[PDB]
Amino acid sequence: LQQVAVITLGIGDLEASARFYGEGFGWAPVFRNPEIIFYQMNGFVLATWLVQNLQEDVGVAVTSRPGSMALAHNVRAETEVAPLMERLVAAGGQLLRPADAPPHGGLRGYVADPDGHIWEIAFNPVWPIGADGSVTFAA
Amino acid sequence: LQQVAVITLGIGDLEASARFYGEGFGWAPVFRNPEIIFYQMNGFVLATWLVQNLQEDVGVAVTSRPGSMALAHNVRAETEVAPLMERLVAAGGQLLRPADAPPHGGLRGYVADPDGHIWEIAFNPVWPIGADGSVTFAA
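The joint structure predicted for all components is written out below.
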């Protein structure tokens, strides 16, 4: 089945990460200990694990730097993009691209978390957002 | 709201990537063009976009190498971990860690896609998997 159970991001400091996701996104953890934090998302779990521990679990050297990837958070109105991005920046985020209209229409910007993981904050009215998140592609 | 709308992975070759996700995971795209492929997942969309295009959209230099992250796919029985991993490897995946029992119990291994993005194939009976994916953390 087409499923992702957990998105795990390697991080360097739990407090800094918790600040970004908690004070920036307004998310609350479902689990937390000195090495990992879990947030219940729309169909899966987001985990922020200290890099040393992630690397240890994989068994091979895993870089601490962000990679070729971006996670998008879609909002319900164009007026929500800018405000949310400001909140992320105020919570330790690094502004990468101020919100503007992408080729595929709508409005989107980019902000990276404290560890460099890229987040796209976007308004894309073409893709339905269900009652409890659940985003579905639509032509 | 606690939501991820899209997980975008930067890739170098669509055919190689499509082979891994299609022949390895058995997933089918909902959208595809010469630069990007979208797969409808459990509450969100997985996108594999040519790195040049991803970098262009963010506006800043974005590495082509994988980063400090891992995506997990949870199976419904311990006997499914090994077979699925073999299929991923046969589809171009790189075996990083043969399946074994992690500290938190269960069974899990790691295989990276053609571009280096790390996938954990795991059996974790403690976390419920709903009718259409939807994985939820449970103590």
